[PDB]
């Protein structure tokens, strides 16, 4: 029933992992060696973990796919937002490109319809700096 | 109502030194504003100021218009002592004729500017009247 923000390729630090887990009924040694299995592939980037124990003092559960923010930047070719939204809008795109990017985001998107899919991309666009023209 | 020596012999023909009129933004109906009732050679300075601090707290759209402006002034200590007093000027303004059209917080729906002016009254000096115009304030 805990939530952490552990690093990658380092499953032995006493300062954070020690007190934050040991007092909650979690064996620090064994819970750490299990991470050296799934975080070894994508080592280097901080990966948040959500450990959930029971009444036997064990388990590991859901650690992680990755980023989904930097790959969108690679396509457009803007890092970060320009400045402040609704004051310096200068990044227009088109209608047809916003239509196909929402068709794959459906799993974590609002509803499985086509009208509701285009409406979320309208809210997160104007809150940053991507006006649809 | 003691006033000055003339509009060009004593002290008449100035800019009075201040910070112009208009601010805020337009607005066809919404009548948002401020006026008074008090009589007082409105304290220039105090004046100029005040109003300004007004913009200081808001910024843009809310007729930060303001229909005032001094243009005459007092005088006192300079020379011998107290007797035959020549005159040394300082502090012009204008008579706030027992109430009248002050400055205007004029605009559609932008009370975010009403409160402003408000802050504008707070300031000022001679009490002030908080009000609306033909229609009110929306």
């Amino acid at each position: 029933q805990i939530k952490l923000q552990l690093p990658a390729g380092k499953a032995t630090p006493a300062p954070p992992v020690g007190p934050a887990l040991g007092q909650h009924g979690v064996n620090i040694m064994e819970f750490c060696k299990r991470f050296n299995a799934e975080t070894a592939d994508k080592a280097g980037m901080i990966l948040p973990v959500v450990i959930t124990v029971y009444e036997d003092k064990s388990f590991t559960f859901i650690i992680k796919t990755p980023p989904a923010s930097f790959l969108l930047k690679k396509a457009a070719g803007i890092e970060k937002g320009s400045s402040e939204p609704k004051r310096k809008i200068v990044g227009k795109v088109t209608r047809k490109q916003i239509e196909e990017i929402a068709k794959t985001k459906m799993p974590d998107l609002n509803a499985n319809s086509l009208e509701a899919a285009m409406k979320i991309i309208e809210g997160t666009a104007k809150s940053m700096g991507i006006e649809v023209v | 109502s003691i006033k000055p020596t003339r509009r060009e012999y004593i002290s008449g023909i100035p800019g009075k030194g201040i910070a112009q009129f208009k601010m805020g933004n337009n607005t066809y109906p919404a009548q948002v504003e401020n006026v008074v009732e008090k009589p007082v050679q409105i304290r220039h300075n105090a004046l100029e100021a005040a109003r300004n601090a007004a913009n200081r707290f808001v910024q843009n759209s809310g007729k930060f218009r303001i229909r005032k402006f001094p243009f005459h002034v007092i005088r006192e200590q300079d020379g011998d002592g107290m007797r035959a007093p020549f005159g040394k000027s300082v502090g012009t303004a204008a008579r706030s004729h027992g109430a009248n059209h002050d400055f205007i917080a004029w605009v559609n729906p932008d009370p975010a500017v009403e409160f402003a002016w408000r802050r504008a009254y707070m300031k000022v000096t001679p009490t002030v009247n908080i009000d609306s115009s033909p229609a009110g304030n929306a």
């Binding site: 609704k86 004051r87 | 601010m23 337009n26 066809y28 109906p29 009732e37 910024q59 843009n60 759209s61």
Partner: protein, 177 residues
């Protein structure tokens, strides 16, 4: 709407609940009637901005209403109004308003704004023939631009009791452009 009186009694009248207000019309007038309570309501609507009329003895149910008056006094509560009808096909002195919307150009992007020394529009279209609410806003706003008379853009009734190039409504720096 209703409003009565017309004898010769302004003081007390000019007092209480009934405010003076002459019965003005091309050719004839008649003691002041009305009331300090009707003025309210109606007036509250949009005096010389739309128009109606009241039934005093069913006399003459006509429009034209007010072409003058004042909440004068300091207090800011009118007293002593003017009233003139128009059962004619000459209706000229017609001053009805004009509204925009907010079209985004200098504002919701440039923060800039715009003064409208205009708003109203005393003209003279088709007498007893005007849309109590006429709107016209070709948009545009920002930098050192300005629009006024000249351009404008008048629909139907071709009057203009006004002139060209003059207090239309421009866009100024609510801060800086």
């Amino acid at each position: 709407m209703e409003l009565t009186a017309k004898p010769r009694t302004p003081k007390q009248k000019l007092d209480e609940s009934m405010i003076a207000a002459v019965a003005y019309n091309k050719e004839n007038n008649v003691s002041f009637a009305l009331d300090r309570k009707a003025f309210d309501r109606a007036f509250r609507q949009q005096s010389t901005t739309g128009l109606f009329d009241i039934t005093v003895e069913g006399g003459e149910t006509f429009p034209a209403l007010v072409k003058a008056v004042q909440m004068d006094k300091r207090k800011r509560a009118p007293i002593h109004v003017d009233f003139y009808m128009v059962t004619y096909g000459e209706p000229v002195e017609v001053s009805v308003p004009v509204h925009t919307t907010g079209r985004s150009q200098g504002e919701v992007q440039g923060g800039l704004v715009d003064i409208v020394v205009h708003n109203l529009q005393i003209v003279a279209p088709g007498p007893r023939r005007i849309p109590q609410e006429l709107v016209v806003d070709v948009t545009k706003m920002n930098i050192g631009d300005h629009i006024t008379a000249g351009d404008i853009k008048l629909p139907e009734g071709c009057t203009l009791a006004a002139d060209p190039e003059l207090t239309v409504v421009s866009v100024l720096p609510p801060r800086l452009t």
